[PDB]
Amino acid sequence: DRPVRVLFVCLGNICRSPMAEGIFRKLLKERGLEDRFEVDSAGTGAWHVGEPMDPRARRVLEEEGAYFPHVARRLTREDVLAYDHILVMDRENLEEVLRRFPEARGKVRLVLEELGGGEVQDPYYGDLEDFREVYWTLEAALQAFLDRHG
Numbered sequence: 620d621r622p623v624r625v626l627f628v629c630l631g632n633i634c635r636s637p638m639a640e641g642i643f644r645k646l647l648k649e650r651g652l653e654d655r656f657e658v659d660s661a662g663t664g665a666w667h668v669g670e671p672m673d674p675r676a677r678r679v680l681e682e683e684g685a686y687f688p689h690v691a692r693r694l695t696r697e698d699v700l701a702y703d704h705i706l707v708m709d710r711e712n713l714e715e716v717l718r719r720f721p722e723a724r725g726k727v728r729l730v731l732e733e734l735g736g737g738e739v740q741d742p743y744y745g746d747l748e749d750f751r752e753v754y755w756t757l758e759a760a761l762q763a764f765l766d767r768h769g
């Protein structure tokens with residue numbers, strides 16, 4: 620069986636989802652699982668296509684050694700077909716994915732389901748500390764994802 624494909628999804632793909640991808644990439648390295656997983660992140664919207672992640676996101680990832688070259692892009696029908704796990708940040712993201720691609724019925728779910736449910740709050744209107752809070756919330760969810768899938 621081929622490597623498991625994971626796609627993190629938020630609205631703009633410049634804050635929460637790219638941070639989730641950076642953290643995941645870091646964990647794959649520490650656990651020696653780079654040969655078993657593939658990861659990327661995308662947004663439901665197209666407002667930021669082609670842009671790098673938010674400066675606050677880049678800063679926090681650099682602080683934790685989880686930065687990577689990210690380019691924001693918008694989720695496509697191909698993504699829904701190709702990825703095995705479509706992990707969204709909150710319920711609005713979840714409803715939006717299902718609206719455009721009902722075909723993702725079984726594989727899309729809240730990233731925090733790994734910890735029994737919840738939504739990762741949007742830090743866009745906050746400051747660096749809100750971005751750090753998002754980082755650790757995502758870090759906890761992904762360590763659990765790898766314990767169960769790794």
Ligand SMILES: [Mg+2]
Nearest residue numbers: 659660689690
């Ligand atoms: Mg990418």
